[PDB]
Every structure is written in structure tokens, then in C-alpha cells.
């Protein structure tokens, strides 16, 4: 029958993605694919056999159009009139990592498995990360030509 | 911003030089000893920690005794933190330094912070000042109940209904210090400060005035 991963089959590797001057949606989709484990031939929707992803230079990220000042990030507290909105500009200048985190999180499934997969994403506004001990492999977003 | 820990003693009456009456609350701004310095390079924020009250050394548990010994001072009953703005402000305190009442001056404006009295389980009439319904003209057993609660058929969050009341930290702003008695370490603060007699309060320079 079809191959199925066992207890000790999954192996993880660490990729670090430099978000300087990268389109937000492109980087978000690439990181979501990496987290999901879609690039592995051993992929299985049941298991989170993905890889850990580190995103540095989150504040240098690229947003096209005039979305920097016209795209809103919404949140409701639950109390009446508890709706708060921030454009990507102030969100970037206050919590730079949150824009990338939200974008990446929106593109991966909303199950409990998605919640477990989210644990494997680390983003940083600076040019450096504290995960040098794992020796992440630099990752570049290429396109397979057909 | 200066600050000190004190105890509410009670309220009394005094007269100023225009013969007007001033109702003053007496606060025992007792001696405080600085126990710890919070620094940005270590804790991420600048603040100073003060100890107040007298307690028997056989009453303090071992962790607290160890902390006080590491500070280098004998244990006190109460410990609290004063949050400053920057390192230049916290440079003037050092561990073991004693603060007494005279850091304040006559006529200064202060911010007293205390824990309000407990009122227990209180109805909306008392907890929120709801106007009642009629006591006559046919009203049937609704003399004190809230009434309506008011498409989705849902009681929205924040409903001002009955519940426990009191026992919350309260700050009263822009109180004037009528007199600073240095002999007894007593502040005479014009007005009413939160909490019961014998409770802990924090006296700080006003943030507004």
C-alpha cells in the first residue's frame, strides 16, 4: 500500500529567508509551502513533516501599490464598538514582524494541525537571528520553469 | 517623580491662615529602605523598589529572607516598585538608602494609590447607580432589579449588572499636602485617600500638576 510515515521517520531542516525587498505575498506563500512540508516527496496531509523557517529583515519587506497606507489589519475585541484598524504602515513601524506572521499564518490551513505548524515559524525584524546553533540553510525563492 | 510608601491613619480637621477649615487625612509616610534597582540594561525598564513596615525576622520565609540578605538590609513587611522614566532619574537612588517624609514639601501635589474598601456582592443600584423602578403604581417585585438587558439575541459583553464591588487599586490625583510633619513622619493630605485605616498607600508626586 501507500507509504505512511512512522514515529521516527520525519527529519527537519532549518531554512532562513531574507525578506529584504521581497514581495510579501510571494515570501508568505514560499514559507507556507516550506512549513507545510509540500516540498518533500514523503508528504502526507496527516503529518506536519515540514521544516522550521526563519525570516530575517522582516521590516525591509516589499509591498506594492499603495497598500502601505490603504490596507487595514482588523481586530475586534468583542465589546461593542471594539473594532480597531491599523494600516500596514503603522503595523510595520510598530510591530514589523506581525505583518509577515499574519500573512504566513493566513496561507496555511486553519485546522489544529495548522496550529501545530505555526510553532515552526520564527520571524525577526533584524538582520540576524538567535538560531545560529541550528545552522539554518539559506533559502532562495526560485521558480521551476516549464 | 518622588515617591514613598505609607499607611492611612485617619482623617481630622485643621485650619489654614485664612481661618478656613481643611479636612486632612493623616498618612504615616514611614521610613522606606531601597532594596533593589531596576535598570534597563538588566531588567529592560528603570524602576526602584522600596520596602516598608516592621516584621519579626521569624515570620519571613526563606526566599524573602534570602532576597533581603542579598540586598543587605533587614526584612520589612511590604515591598513595592516605583516606575521611573529613565536612567538619569534612577541614578539618585542606591540600595540601602533611606527615604523619609521630608522628600515632600508643603503645598505639593501628590498621587495617593490604595486599595478601596470592600463592599461585597452589590446590586446594580449600588454598583452602577441604576435608577430604580417605581415603588408603587402597580410595580410588581421590580423595585431594584436592572430591568431590560437588551437582533442577535445576545447579552453584549460589558453588561453593567450586579456583582462583587470594591477591593480595587485606586489612584486619587492632585491632592494637596497641607503639612509635612518631619518629627512623626506624617503627611497631612487635604482630601480623602482610598482604603481603610491601617492600609498601605503609595504617595507619589502628581503626574499632572
Amino acid at each position: 500500500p501507500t507509504y505512511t510515515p512512522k514515529a521516527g521517520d520525519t527529519t527537519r531542516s532549518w531554512y532562513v529567508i531574507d525578506a529584504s525587498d521581497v514581495v510579501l505575498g510571494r515570501l508568505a506563500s514560499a514559507a507556507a509551502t516550506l512549513l507545510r512540508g509540500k516540498h518533500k516527496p514523503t508528504f502526507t496531509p496527516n503529518v506536519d513533516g515540514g521544516d522550521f523557517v526563519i525570516v530575517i529583515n522582516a521590516d525591509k519587506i516589499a509591498v506594492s501599490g499603495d497598500k502601505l497606507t490603504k490596507k487595514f489589519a482588523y481586530r475586534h475585541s468583542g465589546y461593542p464598538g471594539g473594532l480597531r484598524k491599523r494600516t500596514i504602515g503603522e503595523l510595520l513601524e510598530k510591530h514589523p514582524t506581525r505583518v509577515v506572521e499574519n500573512a504566513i499564518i493566513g496561507m496555511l490551513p486553519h485546522n489544529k494541525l495548522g496550529r501545530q505548524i505555526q510553532k515552526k515559524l520564527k520571524v525577526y525584524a533584524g538582520p540576524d537571528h538567535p538560531h545560529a546553533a541550528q545552522q539554518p540553510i539559506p533559502f532562495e525563492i526560485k521558480q521551476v520553469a516549464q | 517623580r518622588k515617591g514613598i510608601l505609607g499607611t492611612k491613619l485617619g482623617m481630622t480637621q485643621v485650619f489654614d491662615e485664612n481661618n478656613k477649615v481643611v479636612p486632612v487625612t493623616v498618612v504615616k509616610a514611614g521610613p522606606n529602605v531601597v532594596t533593589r534597582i531596576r535598570t534597563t540594561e538588566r531588567d529592560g525598564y528603570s524602576a526602584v523598589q522600596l520596602a516598608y513596615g516592621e516584621i519579626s525576622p521569624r515570620k519571613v520565609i526563606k526566599p524573602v529572607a534570602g532576597q533581603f540578605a542579598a540586598a543587605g538590609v533587614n526584612p520589612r513587611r511590604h515591598v513595592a516598585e516605583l516606575r521611573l522614566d529613565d536612567e538619569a532619574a534612577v541614578a539618585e537612588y542606591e540600595v540601602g538608602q533611606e527615604l523619609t517624609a521630608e522628600i515632600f514639601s508643603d503645598g505639593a501635589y501628590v498621587d495617593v494609590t490604595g486599595t478601596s474598601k470592600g463592599k461585597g456582592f452589590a446590586g446594580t443600584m449600588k454598583r452602577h447607580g441604576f435608577r430604580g423602578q417605581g415603588a408603587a403604581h402597580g410595580a410588581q417585585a421590580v423595585h431594584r432589579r436592572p430591568g431590560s438587558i437588551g437582533t442577535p439575541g445576545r447579552v453584549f459583553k460589558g453588561t453593567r449588572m450586579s456583582g462583587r464591588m470594591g477591593n480595587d487599586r485606586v489612584t486619587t490625583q492632585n491632592l494637596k499636602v497641607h503639612k509635612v510633619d518631619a518629627e512623626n513622619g506624617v503627611l497631612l493630605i487635604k482630601g480623602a485617600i482610598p482604603g481603610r485605616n491601617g492600609g498601605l498607600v503609595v504617595v507619589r508626586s502628581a503626574i499632572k500638576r
Binding site: 501507500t2 507509504y3 509540500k38 516540498h39 518533500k40 516527496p41 508528504f43 521551476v144 516549464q146 | -
Partner: protein, 59 residues
């Protein structure tokens, strides 16, 4: 698809090349090869590449 993109080819181009090359192995065993024996899958990718036209977008 995952194993083919590991060999720098898309799934659809791979399927077209496999069809043109005449190999009659199905998707179940293609996945079995991709999981179990990567060498065979790589060889199949090469033969599909050979069987493809020189300009796939040509009319």
C-alpha cells in the same frame, strides 16, 4: 508533484513526457517509486524530458 519538482520539472510536463515516451506506469506506482527508489524516479524524469518536444509552447 513533490518528487518531480525535486528534479526540476513540473507535474504536468512530466506526465505529458511520460505519455509521449509510451511508459504505461500509473500514478500509484509512480508515487511508490518517488517514495521508495528515488533513482528510478530520476531515470523516469530523464526519459520524460527526452520524450518532450523542444518547444512545448509551439502550436
Amino acid at each position: 508533484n513533490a518528487a518531480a519538482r525535486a528534479n526540476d520539472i513540473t507535474y504536468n510536463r512530466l506526465i505529458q513526457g511520460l505519455k509521449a515516451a509510451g511508459v504505461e506506469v500509473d500514478r500509484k506506482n509512480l508515487a511508490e517509486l518517488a517514495v521508495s527508489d528515488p533513482a528510478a524516479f530520476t531515470a523516469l524524469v530523464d526519459v520524460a524530458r527526452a520524450a518532450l518536444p523542444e518547444d512545448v509552447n509551439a502550436p
